[PDB]
Amino acid sequence: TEAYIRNKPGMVSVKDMPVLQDGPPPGGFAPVRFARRIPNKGPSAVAIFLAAFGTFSWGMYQVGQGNKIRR
């Protein structure tokens, strides 16, 4: 019998029987961010191109100086 299995010390009616199952805590959990957030905070395209070009120019100048010293 359901009442026999779920008997309460001081209950009178079959209703308000004790119950405790897995479920949300009071408040219903928290949002979980189903969407995606990909930030693009890397260097700009013009910045890296200018860096590469300046690096190439200064490196060729250094190559010239080193070749002069070796000569």
Partner: protein
């Protein structure tokens, strides 16, 4: 309006046994007066007089005695046919047949003769309950006196009717009061009632056509025949008419058995001949109007209810054996009905499932609810179990066990509510 019988209109003039109950007393009081003429008059004449006298079965069923007698076969077949007289009263509260057999046995014997003549019965068997042994001895002595005087035997009277009356005693069983169970017990088997495709008027005591009739009806048969059916129909009202002896017992001041006109108010019956409730009318709580079979009634209904077949049936109850058991405010009606359920569980024969098991279940539930160890849905389940037991059982003892619980649920439900709530509070506190 109804009631207040005079000593001349009372049928059982030796109810308390203040005079000689034997043959000499019987002749002095007016027994065996014109039995020869009554037998000579005719079986059909006797049946017609019973039919137009308004007499109804006094064993509880209330079926018309005249029609019940006319149900017998008119043409004498090979089978001898039988009369049986139900002296086996075991329903709680009623003791009228005890007094009838003990103090007016010659009236019972003359009634057996008259009923056998009117139903073309070869022989009669009086089934006394095993508990009644002094009454059985008195009836044996009366039967021997009648046989010696020639009132019974090959020549019952100047008429040529052949009639033999024997008495057989039970061994303490309440189911044996039922007609088919009584026939089975008289056959020498267990007191287990039969079903009802074969009616007892077709295949009864030994397979022969027999008729089972109550002691009170069979005993009042000669008196109403001698005094006229109109005289009997004068008392009472409508269909249910005549003189019925009520046993008033319980918490009344002076419990007593008294013969009174039919359709007397219950209050008037209690507070005129018996004496009244122990602490006045206001002290009265609940009255069971018939035996323990019929449902009880609260104080409110008993103020104006009439002690007869119809008014007690107009309310959800029945007259039954018309033995009122009163209960005042001092007692607990829940415990009273629990004891009644225990009695029915004890006295069920246990051949058919709804009564063999259901009566025990009802007793256990009533015992639980007496203390209060139950639930609201459990009293609802108790009512449902009552309904399940009632209509699906072999005999009327299932109804007799179901009815008191149903009446208690119908009327005294708040008492059960209070008991259950109090026990729940006590359990929570503990």
């Amino acid at each position: 309006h109804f009631g207040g019988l005079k000593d001349e209109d009372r049928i059982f003039t030796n109810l308390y046994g203040l005079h000689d109950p034997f043959l000499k007393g019987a002749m002095k009081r007016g027994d065996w007066y014109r039995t020869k003429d009554l037998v000579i008059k005719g079986t059909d004449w006797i049946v017609n007089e019973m039919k137009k006298s308004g007499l109804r079965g006094r064993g509880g069923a209330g079926f018309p005695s005249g029609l019940k007698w006319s149900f017998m076969p008119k043409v004498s077949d090979g089978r001898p046919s039988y009369l049986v007289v139900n002296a086996d009263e075991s329903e709680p509260g009623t003791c009228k047949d005890r007094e009838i057999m003990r103090h007016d046995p010659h009236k019972l014997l003359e009634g057996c003769l008259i009923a056998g003549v009117g139903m073309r019965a070869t022989a009669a068997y009086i089934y006394i309950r095993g508990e009644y042994v002094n009454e059985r001895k008195n009836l044996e002595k009366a039967r021997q006196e009648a046989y010696a005087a020639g009132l019974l035997g090959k020549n019952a009277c100047g008429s040529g009717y052949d009639f033999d009356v024997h008495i057989h005693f039970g061994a303490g069983a309440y189911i044996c009061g039922e007609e088919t169970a009584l026939l089975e017990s008289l056959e020498g088997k267990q007191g287990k009632p039969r079903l009802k495709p074969p009616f007892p008027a077709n295949a009864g005591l030994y397979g022969c056509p027999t008729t089972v009739t109550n002691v009170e009806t069979v005993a009042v048969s000669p008196t109403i025949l001698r005094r006229g059916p109109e005289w009997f129909a004068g008392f009472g009202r409508k269909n249910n008419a005549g003189t019925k002896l009520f046993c008033v017992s319980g918490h009344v001041n002076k419990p007593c058995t008294v013969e009174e006109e039919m359709s007397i108010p219950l209050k008037e019956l209690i507070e005129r001949h018996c004496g009244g409730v122990r602490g006045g009318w206001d002290n009265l709580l609940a009255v069971i109007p018939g035996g323990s079979s019929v449902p009880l009634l609260p104080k409110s209904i008993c103020d104006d209810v009439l002690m007869d077949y119809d008014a007690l049936k107009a309310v959800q109850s029945g007259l039954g054996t018309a033995a009122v058991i009163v209960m005042d405010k001092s007692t607990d009606v829940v415990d009273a009905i629990a004891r009644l359920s225990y009695f029915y569980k004890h006295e069920s024969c246990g051949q058919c499932t709804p009564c063999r098991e259901g009566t025990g279940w009802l007793w256990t539930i009533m015992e639980r609810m007496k203390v209060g160890n139950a639930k609201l849905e459990e009293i609802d389940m108790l009512q449902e179990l009552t309904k399940q037991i009632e209509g699906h059982t072999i005999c009327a003892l299932g109804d007799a066990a179901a009815w008191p619980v149903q009446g208690l649920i119908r009327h005294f439900r708040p008492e059960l509510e209070r008991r259950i709530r109090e026990n729940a509070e006590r359990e929570l506190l503990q």
